[PDB]
Symmetry: C2
Subunit: 244 residues, 2 copies
């Protein structure tokens, strides 16, 4: 909460909450953290929000629906992200947000949430929230160490089989910046490579960085703990800037 | 040729030539440049050799067999690279090369040559050159803006169909660092993504960077002309160092 207005806002029709760090209009980042759908690692979320806040972004973090709030989780976290994007656009003027530069940044399981948001914002999220698609648009998406868990899934009842983000890449998918680790023996980067291939085939703009960064847990701990900058951040910021 | 011993050596049983820039023992880079198999862009080759020379490498560039030297080209350039690796190991002591840190770095069509070298060094190159596999080992390989052309191909007579480097990834493939451009509308990065997927499936160590760098031609021109450093170089050097 470093010299910035901290704001806290519970989202409507959900237990999800949003925390914001606020400094013309600025681009805005919404950090969708990890946590295996069991908890939200608040310190990770805040640190990653500050990584962007420090480089000219209004930065938010989303505490999304967890397994303890609802089971089956369903797609509640993806919907929660929509509620968050919509609130940012609605309040852009009073928060000095450029409503055309709202970017969800998903980490670990939050990368899965964000990947699916990029696929369904104009369709399933819009119709579930009954919000106009334009209000839910992610201007770009960022995915850091994405992790797929079968906890996410089952009006709109898709099981983990039809939640392969790489199978539902469409023309409404927006530009995507992805980075992950190549050498986690427990979680190969093959899923992420498949998503990039789907983006490339659908001709959705992207950038992909598969680094030798070790296990996903250590890699994301380092990203949080040791960005003050890390190449993933330099690269994400440059990509975001050049897409403006 | 900046304050370093420049050496020139024609390789045996080939029109291919090698140029070297020489400063304990040092790692060595062999630049396999582009040129569409019609010419070798010497200025590109030299500049890229210097990019590494300046960071503690003995650096060489390979002027490989061209379409004007031999048609069909066959796999002559891949064999030429083997001849070059073998010569470096043979003369490591007098050139202050660490014979366990010899790394071919392929650019544009040379990336295809190097990708195939990583696949066939212990098998088809060894048997065509009648050289022991150990002498031909690439300790790591680097691929920058790789481009596949059907000019490469047809003792060992494979047509362009059986020269998909991603189809012949085996356990003898060595660690691979790849970077390319995501947004060349004429040459999508899908081939490179497929190779990375094959490396990942075969559990060969790798790092992949698909940047929004524009058309392949401009991207490689920039790499040559504007590294003095560019992130692809920082990233390649760090990866090479951490694999030691």
């Amino acid at each position: 909460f470093q010299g910035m207005q901290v704001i806290k806002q519970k989202l409507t029709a959900t237990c999800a909450q949003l925390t914001g760090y606020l400094h013309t209009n600025l681009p805005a980042i919404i950090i969708v953290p990890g946590g295996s759908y069991t908890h939200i690692p608040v310190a990770q979320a805040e640190s990653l929000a500050m990584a962007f806040a420090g480089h000219g972004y209004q930065a938010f973090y989303l505490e999304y629906t967890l397994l303890t709030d609802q089971q089956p989780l369903g797609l509640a976290p993806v919907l929660d992200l929509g509620r968050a994007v919509n609130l940012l656009r609605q309040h852009a003027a009073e928060w000095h947000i450029d409503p055309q530069q709202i970017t969800p940044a998903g980490f670990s399981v939050g990368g899965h949430i964000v990947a699916l948001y990029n696929d369904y914002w104009a369709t399933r999220v819009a119709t579930e929230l009954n919000v106009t698609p334009a209000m839910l648009k992610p201007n770009n998406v960022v995915l850091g160490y994405p992790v797929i868990s079968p906890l996410l899934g089952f009006t709109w009842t898709p099981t983990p089989n039809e939640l392969a983000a790489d199978q539902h890449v469409n023309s409404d998918n927006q530009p995507t910046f992805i980075w992950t680790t190549a050498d986690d023996p427990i979680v190969p980067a093959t899923n992420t490579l498949a998503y990039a291939t789907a983006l490339a085939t659908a001709k959705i703009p992207y950038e992909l960085h598969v680094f030798k960064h070790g296990p996903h847990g250590l890699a994301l701990a380092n990203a949080q703990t040791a960005w003050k900058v890390a190449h993933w951040l330099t690269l994400a910021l440059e990509w975001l800037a050049d897409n403006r």
